[PDB]
Amino acid sequence: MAELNVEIVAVDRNIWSGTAKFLFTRTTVGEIGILPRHIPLVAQLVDDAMVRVEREGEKDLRIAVDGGFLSVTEEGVSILAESAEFESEIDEAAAKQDSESDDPRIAARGRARLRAVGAID
Numbered sequence: 284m285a286e287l288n289v290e291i292v293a294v295d296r297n298i299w300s301g302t303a304k305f306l307f308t309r310t311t312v313g314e315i316g317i318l319p320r321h322i323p324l325v326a327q328l329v330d331d332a333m334v335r336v337e338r339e340g341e342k343d344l345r346i347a348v349d350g351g352f353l354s355v356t357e358e359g360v361s362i363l364a365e366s367a368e369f370e371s372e373i374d375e376a377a378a379k380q381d382s383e384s385d386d387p388r389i390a391a392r393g394r395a396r397l398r399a400v401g402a403i404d
Contacts, residue, residue, distance in 0.1 A: 285319030288359035289335060291346060293367040298346065300359070306335030306344075308362075309395075310353060323356045330388045331395035333362065345370030347396050349388045373400055 290300035305318050310326035333346035351364030366388070368377075378397050384390035397403070 287317065287319050287321075287357065289362075290359050291333065291335075291348065291362040291364060291367055293363075294365045298364070298367045298369060299344065301337075303335055303337040303344070304339050304342065306333070306360075308333055308335075308353060317355055317360065320357075321355070323354075325355070326353045327351070328353055328362075328364070330391045332392055332399055333364070333367070334399055345373045345399055347372065347392060347399075349392050375400070378402070 286302040286304065288301065289303045289306065291298040305316060307314065307316050309315070309329050309331045311329070312326060315326070328348055328351045330349045333348040335344040335346060336342045337344060347368040348362065348364030349366040351362055351367070354361040373396060378393070378400050381389045381393035381396055384393055
């Protein structure tokens with residue numbers, strides 16, 4: 284039971300920065316879950332959006348990053364994404380445009396976005 288400060292930086296500006304319980308992202312190593320009180324580490328994303336929760340089995344910050352740098356630190360995790368997006372940009376509208384797969388990043392992120400939106404199953 285502990286809160287870990289997290290921050291997500293975009294290409295033109297910042298997305299969100301505060302405190303969260305844990306998050307589930309994907310890097311070169313694959314799916315990774317950052318839990319409270321954990322050693323720091325760096326890893327590059329795979330353009331598969333970003334899923335972070337500010338609480339255990341409750342909060343669910345819907346984020347969609349594309350090819351960024353993940354830096355987990357106790358001082359306040361940092362995620363420099365090239366094209367991040369808030370949960371507000373997770374509506375079926377965006378899920379459709381991206382679903383079309385009109386790009387390499389949009390395609391991979393498209394499937395990742397749909398899943399987070401509750402597409403699968």
